Structure 1
Amino acid sequence: AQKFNGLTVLPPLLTDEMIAQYTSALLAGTITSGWTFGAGP
């Protein structure tokens, strides 16, 4: 797992500060609404 010799590592499309936002949104939705937000308004 080193450089040279034509080996490269590409960065992921989504960072970690975005996965944190997604998981916070899911938590807020399940706390404040219940199971309703997954099947409509």
Structure 2
Amino acid sequence: DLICAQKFNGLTVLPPLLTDEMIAQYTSALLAGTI
């Protein structure tokens, strides 16, 4: 995979601090607050 060869030369892709499930709580909260 593209990430694998990258992962193999010293190219690492750190994880986004906020997982998508977390973002989906914010964009739920803002969206649930606005309503």
Q: Shorter-chain TM-score category?
A: 0.5 to 0.7
Q: Which runs of 5+ in 1 are unaligned?
A: 32-41
Q: Which runs of 5+ in 2 are unaligned?
A: none
Give the number of equivalent residue pairs: 31
Percent of aligned positions with the same letter in both sequences?
100
Structure with the greater alpha carbon radius of gyration: 1
TM-score of the superposed pair, with normalisation by structure 2: 0.62
TM-score of the superposed pair, with normalisation by structure 1: 0.57
Q: Deviations over 1:14-38 (max 9, x none)?
A: 100000000010111111xxxxxxx
- In terms of fraction of residues, the more helix-rich structure is 2
